């Protein structure tokens, strides 16, 4: 039961952002096809990083320009086809503030990302195969992590200044962790998800910071549980054995220094928490890589809240994916190396994913 699965990792550069364009920034990152190289202004050394997929979005006519409908067909479409057999899947995004992860996963209204492509193509891939034989169920929830406190986003918050009930996490002995109080809503068509995402993202705690005009101050997790009830050789009752898959799509917050992102008051108090969570989302990658060499180790999952929920996603039973977004300016050289040196770590994680099927009993 189960198979070895190298964790999938992809890298992606963003075109020069407006503020750095006003500063007249020097390009530092280059792509020799697949391999990325980073040259300093110092040019004292030249680090090189190798990955499995290397996108490019600097300018729209370079040969090799991976658009929003290219980071699907190379990264997320395998995750979609791997969740038809039954394997659990994940796709989560690392980077710094302004590196472009909330533009890749969710896109913008005219440029949609992976969530809309995934969902609408899935429903396009369901009505192409759905018959009277095997059913197709889909539920979905959408939660966030704000200052070490889980919150739901599809809970229409009304008449108070703090309609923001803090939920909690718990550990099931077999099914692993789970959130208590999580609205798990049912969907049938893409027209049902667009009204949830439309409400969820309006609830996600965004703010205005020096790095970019709309900066997320939260990690967001987006679930889809798809169970297909199959029929096959039996004695009597059919529609019994069913294969279940859990697709989690995660959009994180960013490294954010206090100088580069002018902030005080409350902005600085959630900045710390993003940083502590992403300080622990590094230990979990580093120490899981150190398992590949036989070296016995402990993965500090419980040091934070996000890496406690996404615990079966990094290791565990999940075919996972790390999209790694990095800026091309020289002002963002002391933080792009940090992103890419963790992306190269993530590729070495071997996790065992197994098709999930339970016979009626």
């Amino acid at each position: 039961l189960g198979s070895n699965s190298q964790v999938t990792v992809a890298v992606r550069v963003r075109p020069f952002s407006k503020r750095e364009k006003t500063e007249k920034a020097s390009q530092v990152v280059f792509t020799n096809g697949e391999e990325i190289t980073v040259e300093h202004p110092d040019m004292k050394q030249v680090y090189s990083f190798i990955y499995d997929v290397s996108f490019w979005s600097f300018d729209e006519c370079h040969p090799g320009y991976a658009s929003q409908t290219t980071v699907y067909e190379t990264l997320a479409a395998p995750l979609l086809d791997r969740a038809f057999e039954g394997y659990n899947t994940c796709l989560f995004a690392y980077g710094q503030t302004g590196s472009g992860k909330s533009y890749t996963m969710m896109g913008l209204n005219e440029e949609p990302g992976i969530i809309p492509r995934f969902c609408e193509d899935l429903f396009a891939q369901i009505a192409k195969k759905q018959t009277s034989e095997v059913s197709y169920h889909l539920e979905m929830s959408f939660f966030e992590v704000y200052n070490e406190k889980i919150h739901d986003l599809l809970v229409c918050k009304g008449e108070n200044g703090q309609r923001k009930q803090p939920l909690r996490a718990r550990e099931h002995p077999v099914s692993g962790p789970y959130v208590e109080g999580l609205s798990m809503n049912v969907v049938s068509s893409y027209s049902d998800i667009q009204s949830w995402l439309e409400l969820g993202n309006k609830q996600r705690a965004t703010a205005a910071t020096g790095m970019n005009d709309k900066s997320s101050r939260s990690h967001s997790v987006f679930t889809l549980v798809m169970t297909q009830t199959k029929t096959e050789v039996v004695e009597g009752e059919e529609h019994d054995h069913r294969i279940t898959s859990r697709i989690n799509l995660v959009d994180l917050a960013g490294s954010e220094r206090c100088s580069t992102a002018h902030s005080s008051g409350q902005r600085l108090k959630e900045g710390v928490s993003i940083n502590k969570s992403l300080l622990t989302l590094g230990k979990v990658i580093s120490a899981l890589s150190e398992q590949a060499n036989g070296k016995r180790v402990f993965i500090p999952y419980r040091e934070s809240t996000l890496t406690w929920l996404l615990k079966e996603s990094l290791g565990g039973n999940s075919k996972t994916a790390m999209i790694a977004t990095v800026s091309p300016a020289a002002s963002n050289i002391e933080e792009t190396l940090s992103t890419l040196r963790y992306a190269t770590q993530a590729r070495l994680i071997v996790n065992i994913a197994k098709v999930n099927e339970d016979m009626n009993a």
Partner: protein, 440 residues
């Protein structure tokens, strides 16, 4: 008029300051109350010089100090002690929230509530000065205050003043002795911010002074008082040219141009050789040659480093008392011949020299002797590459596992600012093997 503003950060800085001002006040005659009888004994003069003191119309001579710290268990000992009627009540203690031995707390969170006031007091001290030469920050690598708050102040003053020396005496971390598990981090994080503003960062280690006291004074139980007194003597010898008259007088801009070849190798070592009991005061001639050779003795350094694992690159030698010049030139000739004291191919001179006519003071209840010829040396070597490498390795054994960083992130620091401060020190350690490579 020459003037220098001595700033004293942290417990170590304040205690060195206490020793320093005890020493200066004995040297001039100004008493702890602030009064100067010597203006009323003979008829007048400049008995306590306005470089390191001020004047008030009633006759209270008042120092040019600031005495910053973020825990009140130390400045409140000054307010309550012998030197209470001397200092100005604006001693810029917070009362609150020590820096917890992390850079983050003293640089961004608990160090932003007092720096806007330090600059006010320094402005008030500098606007009342006709000719300002520089600063003298006395801090300690290892803690949060003396690592972070100094870095912040030295970034604000670099903007405000800019064309002024910003020298800094520091308690360098030892290889073996330590009082914290976080000194490597703090030091690496500090140099990053002070390899760009500061202009000469003088260093000492407490292990070196322990061993000095042991071998040269017969003290087997030395405390911080006796250490800080030797530091006070170094601070008197580096300042003796501004407060006295002598033959060769080295202003504080005459070090910056003679010891810092390149703008990043500005970490000189210090030493003060005639450390002697009253016992060995007799049975010693205590001449120039004996000292000058004693100052290049490895077992008479104030930093745990071997001078023979590098090459010298500059030396400034400052004497006090009955020193004639050719007693020096004979000695520099004695040192320019010895194969052990090895200099670079690009600095043949390397022997800046100063002389002064006021001998050293000695405090009662002290562990030092009355000497008519005191000496200090400020050297610039390639030996401290190994100390910096040791700190680099201490760091690298911990940042591998990201230990203690959740206590720095907590108070305003990202995790990419540790890798950005480790690269600069590697570049420096490479700029210490770029200099010992002989030219063609």
């Amino acid at each position: 008029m020459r003037e220098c503003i001595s700033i004293h950060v942290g417990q170590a800085g304040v205690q060195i300051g206490n020793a320093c001002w005890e020493l200066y006040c004995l040297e001039h005659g100004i008493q702890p109350d602030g009064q100067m009888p010597s203006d009323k004994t003979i008829g007048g003069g400049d008995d306590s010089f306005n470089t390191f003191f001020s004047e008030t119309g009633a006759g209270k001579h008042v120092p040019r100090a600031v005495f910053v710290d973020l825990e009140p268990t130390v400045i409140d000992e000054v307010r309550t002690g012998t030197y209470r009627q001397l200092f100005h009540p604006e001693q810029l203690i917070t009362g609150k929230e020590d820096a917890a031995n992390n850079y983050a707390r003293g640089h961004y969170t608990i160090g932003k509530e007092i720096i806007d006031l330090v600059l006010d007091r320094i402005r008030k001290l500098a606007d009342q000065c006709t000719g300002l030469q520089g600063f003298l920050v006395f801090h300690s690598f290892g803690g949060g205050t003396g690592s972070g708050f100094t870095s912040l102040l030295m970034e604000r003053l670099s903007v405000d003043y800019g064309k002024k020396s910003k020298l800094e005496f520091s308690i360098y971390p030892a290889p073996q002795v330590s009082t914290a598990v976080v000194e490597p981090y703090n030091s690496i994080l500090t140099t990053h911010t002070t390899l760009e503003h500061s202009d000469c960062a003088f260093m000492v280690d407490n292990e070196a002074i322990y061993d000095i006291c042991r071998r040269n004074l017969d003290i087997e139980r030395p405390t911080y008082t006796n250490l800080n007194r030797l530091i006070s003597q170094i601070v008197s010898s580096i300042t003796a040219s501004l407060r006295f008259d002598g033959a060769l007088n080295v202003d504080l801009t005459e070090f910056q141009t003679n010891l810092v070849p390149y703008p990043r190798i500005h970490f000189p070592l210090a030493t003060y050789a005639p450390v002697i009991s009253a016992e060995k005061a007799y049975h010693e001639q205590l001449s120039v040659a004996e000292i000058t050779n004693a100052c290049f003795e490895p077992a008479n350094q104030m930093v745990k480093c071997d001078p023979r694992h590098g090459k010298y690159m500059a030396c400034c030698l400052l004497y006090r008392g009955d020193v004639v010049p050719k007693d020096v030139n004979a000695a520099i000739a004695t040192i320019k011949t010895k194969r052990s004291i090895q200099f670079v191919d690009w600095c043949p001179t390397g022997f800046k020299v100063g002389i002064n006519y006021q001998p050293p003071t000695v405090v009662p209840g002290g562990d030092l002797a009355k000497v008519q010829r005191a000496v200090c040396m400020l050297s610039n070597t390639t030996a401290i590459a190994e100390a910096w490498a040791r700190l680099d390795h201490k760091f690298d054994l911990m940042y591998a596992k990201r230990a203690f960083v959740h206590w720095y992130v907590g108070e305003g620091m990202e995790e990419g600012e540790f890798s950005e401060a480790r690269e600069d020190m590697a570049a420096l350690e490479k700029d210490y093997e770029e200099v010992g490579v002989d030219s063609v």
